[PDB]
C-alpha cells in the first residue's frame with residue numbers, strides 16, 4: 001500500500017506515535033516519506049547482508065527475522081514480512097521499541113539527514129487530525 005501523506009499521519013496518530021518519546025507526528029511522517037516514500041512494501045538490501053523492511057525501513061540485523069541475516073537478533077519478535085503489510089500496526093509497534101532504545105530517532109538515517117532540525121510540522125499541515 002502506498003499511503004497518502006494525511007492518511008498516514010492519521011494512521012500513525014491513532015497508533016500512538018504523536019509525541020511518542022517526545023517526537024511530534026511530523027517527525028514520523030517525515031521519516032516515512034524519505035525512508036520508503038510511504039510504501040509499505042519497500043525493501044532495501046544493506047551492505048552487511050541485512051535488509052530494511054517496510055514503511056519505516058526496519059533492519060533485519062536487529063529487529064526482525066527474515067531467515068537470511070546470520071547472527072542477527074529479532075528484538076521485535078516478528079518475521080520481517082509482517083512489516084510489509086498494509087496494516088502499519090506491526091511497523092509502529094516495532095518502531096516504538098527502536099526509538100526507546102536510547103538513540104531516539106537517530107536510528108533512522110533519513111530522519112537524521114533530512115528531517116532533524118527542519119520544520120517537520122509542515123508534513124502534517126492541512127490534514128484532519
Ligand SMILES: [Cl-]
Pocket residue numbers: 024025026027120121122124
Ligand atoms: Cl509535527
Ligand SMILES: [Cl-]
Pocket residue numbers: 021022103104105
Ligand atoms: Cl530522544
Ligand code: NA
Pocket residue numbers: 060061062063064065066069072073074
Ligand atoms: Na534478524
